[model samples]
Each structure stands twice: as structure tokens, then as C-alpha cells.
Target: GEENEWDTPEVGDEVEVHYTFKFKLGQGQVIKGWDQGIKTMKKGENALFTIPLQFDVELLSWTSVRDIAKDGGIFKKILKEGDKWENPKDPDEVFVKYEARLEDGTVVSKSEGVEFTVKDGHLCPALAKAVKTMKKGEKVLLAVKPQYGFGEMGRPAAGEGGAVPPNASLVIDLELVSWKTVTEIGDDKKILKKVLKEXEGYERPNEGAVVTVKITGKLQDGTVFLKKGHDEQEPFEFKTDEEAVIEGLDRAVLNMKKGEVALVTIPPEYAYGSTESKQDAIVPPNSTVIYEVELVSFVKD
Candidate 1:
């Protein structure tokens, strides 16, 4: 309820709620919580552990440890992990539908919640700090002082008799709706999303995986610019984080599972990006593109 963070999360070890994104643990991450009650981790090692610890599950031969998930130095855990697990990477683009209120129960903003990265200048300092301690599917309540919140001066329209009064103290009933691993993309805001339909499984592709998808690109008016069938332009494999597609499209695919379909609306910056750039046949400069794409299959790296 209060303190988060864990002592060395092993690969298979479920931290806090559900830290599914496992990797190798190291120095400062966990300084060996050796206890007499707990002798050794014979059940130690990963891909595989339980009721324990970051870093690698060096004990499990089943664990296919990779160099990609190098270091996850956190005793910082939170809210809920998964059915039992979920882990997010740096600059995780968090999605949420939460309620915001003033201390006196006044509705500050009818904000269902917004998605943001834990990077500088992108989010309010207090909120951003709070996010770092949260896991996916968590609801964190925050009581923010003026300096930590809207500060001595509230937000633009939020100041002086606005939604947020002058130097207003704030309260948040926040829930971590969803998140994305967009470290490769750098700017999480550059990618926007709308889930047209949910999928069947919880197993999503990790970052740097190769995916095969079927895509239908169109304009806002529903003009189909491009289409790929299961056997037509079939098996078009796009490398994740490789910029094989538009910025937004690349990020969207990372959130899908096999047979999951999403209608992604890409802004100009994430689309053709204001220049004739690449394919200008349909999507021109500064044009927003929409693609109804489905993941056929993904073979993770």
C-alpha cells in the first residue's frame, strides 16, 4: 500500500504484483537479501522463481537470458503486476482512464486520464514521479502539494478561478490503463492510438521482435490506399523499432497480439512527417494516416 521496489527481481520471480518483463539483476539493484528463513534458491534461476527478487534467474536452465534486457535495477515495484505479471520499459507510454479531483471533492478536470511518458518536460513533475512507482493496471491515489503540483501557479486555464484554483492542492484517483515500450521510438507522444478491438491472448510481442502483419491503409474518409492479404502481399515482416513503417504505425504494432486488430490514427509527425518523404501516393505532407492492421504472427527475437 505504501512502499514499492523489491530486492533483486529474478527472471521468473514475480515482483510485487506482476513484473513480467524480466531481465538480469545486478549491483545496487539488490544487495543480497539473504535470510535464515530462506536458505537457498534451489528453485533459483529464471525464464523460470517465486516469492522473490531483479536481474537474471541464473538458477534456471530453462531461462533463455538475452543481452537485450541487460539491467533492470529496481527494488521499485507497485500496484499490480499481472494476472500475476507486467513490466514496462523506460519512457513507457502509460495509458489510463482515471478521475481527478480537488481536495474538497471538486472535479478538477473531467479527465478520464491521459497517456504520458516519464520523461522531462512531458508531464507534471509530481504526476510523473508518481508514475515511476506504478505498475500496469494499478490505481494510485495521490495528494499533491502546490509546489509539487500545479505549483504556486496552476496550469494555463487551470489558474485563478479556473479548474485548478490558485496554488491549488490536487488529488488524483489514477489508474494505469495500459503502457507501451517505446524507448526505441524515443518520443512516446509521437505515437498515438485507439484500440478498435481487443485481442484474445495476453502475450504481446516484446521490443525488437519481428512481426508479420496484414495492413489496410486509408485516409480519414476511408479511402483504401494500400492493402495486404493473408496470401496477397502476405507475410510482410516488419522489423520492430526499425522504422520500416511510419513512427506511429511502428509503435502501434508493438501493442498487438496474434490476430489482434487495431485502427491506428497517425499524426503528420508520425506519418509522412511533413515532407514528400517516402510514399506520397496517398499520404502527403502533414497528412494524418489511418491503418486498420492485424497481427498475423510474431516471432520474437
Candidate 2:
């Protein structure tokens, strides 16, 4: 358990050491000198406390508690590791499952699967902080202090009797199952790319590259305005640097890889600007459009 460094326990926190004794800090669970001397020591550090005239001690391991608020208002413990190293950003929509309970193990809230943007947090303040540190499939237990939970003034019970008392701490089990990746095309945010299917390899079309794509363009009302490569038809070919397609579509394709499928949202400025396209009467001027595009192949210019 000492293979890695662990955090030193805080007052009111628990610790396990030699002789396999687990006790709480700053509490009368142990001798007064033991608590006073151990607080200054770190994990894996060996020291001698004068309480026993000469008691040799080696700090083993303590619960890895994260003080999210830095005020001891919230703490978290990882129960299950997750895959991948990347965590969802503030703008990305995340999928998660969680169960929250009171101190007495009374179930207060639970969810099977819920999806929301990281910026739009749900449940409690600790969840937003914990999710940002978690990866896909990660599971963690949270100890939310009152300030981050129901606050100093607890709310009334819902349905049956489950009202959270004021100044009460909560135990929450949360899991970040997955998330959707969204790429903002430019600083203006006129074009957006939402990945529908992840692609293999990191290769993507470069500027002036000749690319082949399968596209289904539609209006906001589900009207199909343009289609290419449907029903075994030949895919469309265009140069990335050339204005062969809409500005948003050209820029979005440059960010895609072979076999990658994505749904692109193009505003009027990126689609056709204020002027309507003479090639198609169905496309109205100053109207937004969506395209389901698949990058089939690309050859660098």
C-alpha cells in the first residue's frame, strides 16, 4: 500500500498504520501525544514520538481525500479506476450515473444514466469538481460537507420522509460513464463539429488537400436539401482550400479523419453568408444548415 505516496490525514479523518490499527485523527481514539505528533508527519515518513519515551512509528497509508473547496467542505475517494487519461472539458456533454445518501445510509437520490454539459452541473457543487478530475468509466465516492451539499439551510423532504437536516454531510456514489466530443471550429463559433463515430488513426486532410466525402445536407426542419454518395452513388470530391463546398463544410472536413462521421452545424455566415446560393433555390439566405458528413479518403495537394 506504500507503493505510492498518499495524503496525510486531516483532523477528523481516518488512518491505518502498523499493528493494523485504524483510528481517527484529533479524536480521543488514540493518545493525545500520538495525534499531536502524527499530524506533523507525512505518508511513508518514519518518525519517533516521545509519548512512549521512545515510540518508533512509520506512517503507512491514509484515505486519499481531496479537499475540493480547500475549506474541508467536500472530499472524494476513488473506488474504481477509469479508462483513458482525458477528462471532459467544461463545454463537453458528459454521461454519468450516481446515487446519493444521507449519513445514516438513507437513499436520497439516484440516477441510472444522465447526460448534461460539464458547465451545467447537476446534483451538487462537488460533482462538478469531481467530474472534471475523472476519466471515462471512473467511479468515486464523495463526502460532501454541508456547504457544498444542501448548505446551512437544508431543504424539505420530497415525497416520503427524506429531508436533509441542516449542516448534514452526504455520501454520494458517482460514475462518469462517457461523454460526447464537440469541436468548435473557430473563435467566432459559427461552425461546430460533433463527432458521431470515432475514427481510426490521427490522419486528417490538410489545406489544399483533395478529399472525398459522403454528405447529407438538411434544413432545420428535416428537409433534405443536398445529398451525395447515397445508394452506392459516387462520393463528392473537392479541394479543401478551394470554395468547392460551403466554408463550414470545408473547414470541418480538414479536422476529420478517414472513416470519421460527424454532424456539423453551420450558421448562416459560414454556410452562405447573407447572399443566397444561385445553384440551389431550396437553400434560403441567412438560414442555418446541418450536414451529416463522412470523410471517405483524402490525398494531400
Candidate 3:
């Protein structure tokens, strides 16, 4: 019942309506005019039924049956609510638990803690679009159209007894449990930081703050170059704005919270530039580097 009408109920859906008439749409419980007119009206829209009976109605919120693709490709109905407002992006890794069924009620697929990027998608193409609109902990029942399903060339049997037939629609019960947020730290969009472990709070090292970190640096081919602050050694200490570390690392640590762990990728420009590391030639020239960093602690100046 918000400003934009994003959801509506179909026939056999229990619509929570105003104006004192309560019945399923197109169920013959109401008159023919009410059945046809009510279905045409969206959430928060008002309509007048003049089947010569003179009835006025205003649709309140109801069970959500959204046209996810808006072209009859996929329909979704909410089963449980989520905690937050932000949804996952294509690059963000999403974790879900899902059960899929065929039209005849045969369980085709079921899994828990299934993790995948939205762009990589699930078995069905509609799954990519579905999770993009879902928040963490949100569960929904999705009715996938044939085109969005296996399509003409049905999925081959995986030798596990769950092969989808061509042109067959599917009913998917999906839950978006959680996801990891990917952050691009550099203005040139070359540096990427993916959080490996969540932090305890929101406090992050600010500009010019004194920061202590555990770091392991490696080349693109997985050659270990620099390792510090592990196995009971003292953490590497630096000032965020004092150029105490490489530029990419200095920028990355400023966005990190205490106890947070992240995997950061740095390009050659943000890293050591054209010159290789002089100490033991650890980092080669024009080589991109990767680091697994942990913000152990920080003190703001």
C-alpha cells in the first residue's frame, strides 16, 4: 500500500481489503463484476463496481504476488520478512537455502547454505533476478515461467535424479540468508576489498589515525612476499595519512574496523608503481598484488 504499486494478488490469494468485502478473487464468492474489477485494481487503488450494484472499493495491502520480471516471466510471493532494506548486487556473494519443485509436486532440487554470486546465478536464470530484490532472511515462493526455467533444451540429468523437463514451469521456495558486501576502495575502481570476516562494531580507523594490522602480501601468482603480525609477532604499525605504508594499503586500512579481516586486490599504480620493492625484490615492477589484512586495533589522533 505504499506509493508505488509493486505487488498485487492473483486469484485464490487472500487479499486484505477495505470496504467490508472479504473473499478470494474469481472464486465465485463475489459477483462477476467484483471479481474482474478487484483484480484489475492494484494496491491502494480505488475502483467503483457498477455492475448495476453500485459498489465502491479501495484496495489495501494484501499478500504479495509480484511480477518480478513484469512480463509474466516470474511471479513471487513473500513467505517471511527480512531484516534490512539493502539487497544484494550482482558482484556480491549471496547465501541461500532453497527447495525447488515441479508442477506435479516432485522435489527437483533442495539445498542449504548454497552460496553463489548473483551474476553466476543458480540453476535457473530467474534466480539471479530474484535474489537481487530480496533482503537478508527474506523468504519467498517463486513461480518461474517456462522461459526463465530450463527452456527448450531441458537440463541433462546430473546423475542424481533431478533433471528438469523442457518447457516446464517450476515452483521455487527460496530464502536469502545472508551476503557479503564488496567495496571498491580506490577512486579509479582498481582496488577491491572483500570482507572475509565481519567486525565487532562500526568504528573504523579514520584519516591520520594510528593503526596496527596483520598483513600477508602476495603476487598475482600466489608468491608470498611480505608476512607480518602473525604467530605472536608484533603487528605492523602505521599512520593512515603519513605514507607509512604503500598507498593502496594506507587507503584500505582507513576503511577497516577493529577485528575486521579483508582480502584486498591492488593494481600496480596504487601499489609499488613502476619500481620493484628494493628489500629482497619481494614485489616485482608492474605487478599487481593481493593482501589478506586484519585491522587489529586503532587509535584516532
Candidate 4:
């Protein structure tokens, strides 16, 4: 039965998946093999499985889970007991802290002690689902199925024609920081209402106001691309309609009042389109981009 191989996971059900991926020789799409080995266990249950190699001919031996782990594993020790999964109610505004590692245990990315919101449509399907069931401060180990992780697009290659061979899976450790409702956001309408109530002179900015702002952009996977105020020499400042920023930024700023901050998630079409950066430009065409923006000030002129 189809359900026998893959079942929709329920809330609080422990899910452990193991899979392999194969890149079809000349195409961008890849094939995957996965088993929902631990889909029905209770909150605290644990499961394990091994994914055999040979799934992809082009897969390099160095990228294998065992080899990657051996090089410099991500965690100092294996996971201990008493850990459980918790889901966040508002999937879009979840704040979390996480660490990413390769199969053998190499730490690839780690977040600062800061909290961040994972907006809707910004996360891959499986991860979004996993985070929805977690509560503030709960922790979990997720063995990502290949379909949810990078498929045929492995890490991008270096040089003009470089490409990352596809078919790789990632293991992540996620800890929930907190969750906020749309109303709890500072610039949210509901929060604005409270601000209006508290301040006699509060005013919302009308669209088309010439605004000055600082912005930073990142990938959905948490890679930083363009940032302002971080480097002393590099800074970004521009008017709202000057076409100085991407389309998503252009659209988002129109609705903001002075001193408001917005974190926006943009689909690929509104960004660089289909072009790859030839030099220091880190953005690739057809890629979704995320931005954390602070509207410093605004004026009608």
C-alpha cells in the first residue's frame, strides 16, 4: 500500500526517516528513496535506520554521511534521552535557534543566541511541519528526508561553471525560542493600534512617501548575502521607488511607517530573476530571498 511506505505524520508522532538521492545524469531533477521508518512512535520514542549508498553514481565518497561525520562531526556526543519535539502554533512567526551539521558531525551553520522568525512559505515543507509541532524551548533532532533537503543541487560549485552534485541530505538540531502572533509584531496592525492608543501623536505613513532605510538579505537557509551596518565600509541607503532595491523590498516599504521594522520573505521572481551573480553579488536568479529591514525615517518630499 502507498500508505505503508509513506504515511502523513501526526502531531507528537516521532518521525525518523532515512533516504538516498540520485541525480539523473544531465538534468537538474534527482531521484530519492525514503522510508518513514518511525512515523507512529509517541513523543519520547526513538528510532534509527541506515541509508545505503550506491543510490547515486555521481555522489562523491567524501560527502557520504559517515565520511562527513568523521571529518569533524557537528555534535560532541550522540543525542541523549529525555529530548522531545514541540510544535509552534503560528507556523509563520516562529522564533527558533538551531545548529546545522553534516552526516559525520561537521558543523556547517550555527545561529547566534538571537531569535528569528521563520515566515510562512519560507521553509521547506517538512521543516515547516516539524516546527509547527514544537513549543517554546523544546528541542528535537530531525533526520531530513532528501526531498526536503537539497536534491540535485548540492553546494554550489566554485568558478564560472561550478555546480554542486545533487542528492544530499542534512541533519539539524533545532530548539524553539518563542512564538509571536501577527498582532504581537511591532509594526503589525494590532500592535499599531495599541501604539496609537498609547501615543496621542501616532500616525501611519501614507504610501509613496520618500523613505530612508537600512536592509539586510539572507537565503531561506540562513545564508547572509547583503547586509548593512555590519561592515563599517559597506552600507545600503536608498529611496523607496528609485528601483534601488529588489521588487519585494519595493512592495514592502510602501506600507511601513517611519521607524517600523519588517522581516520580509521574497520569492525568486521578485529578485534577480534567472541570472547568477558573476562577481561579488551573492544572489542567484530564481532564488527566494529573505530580508530584515528597518525603516529609519520617512518624509513626503
Q: Which consecutive 10 residues in model 1 have the weakest lDDT in total? A: 61-70
The local distance difference test score of model 4 is: 0.48
Ranking 1 against 4 by lDDT, winner? 1
Q: How accurate is candidate 3 locally (lDDT)?
A: 0.80
Q: Would you list the C-alpha lDDT of every candidate in the order shown?
A: 0.56, 0.79, 0.80, 0.48
Number of the top TM-score candidate: 2
Worst 10 residues of 2 by lDDT: 1-10
Off by over 4 Å in 2: 1-63, 150-169, 218-226, 272-288
Best by lDDT: 3
**Candidate 1 similarity to native, TM-score:** 0.45
lDDT, model 4, position 112: 43
Please give the clash total of every predicted structure, in order. Answer: 26, 0, 0, 18
lDDT of 3 by residue, 55-174 (tens): 567887566566779877988777786887999988778899888888888778888878997888987888888998887898998898878888988676675447889888999899
| TM-scores of all predicted structures | 0.45, 0.71, 0.69, 0.36
Model 3 stretches with alpha carbons more than 4 Å out = 1-13, 16-62, 197-209, 217-226, 241-248, 266-290, 299-301
lDDT of 1 by residue, 56-145 (tens): 334331221121212321122233432225544445666665455678987655456676655642334555655555567765555566
Better of 3 and 4 by TM-score: 3
Candidate 2 per-residue C-alpha lDDT over 1-301 given as tens digits, one digit per residue, 9 for 90 to 100: 0111144667755676663257776778886656766666688787766543555667776654566677767777766768979988776678999888899998777889998877778877767778888889989889888878888777578863367788888999999999877788866866878788887799899999999899988878877788886658876889996888888999999999998998888998888778766543378888788989999889987
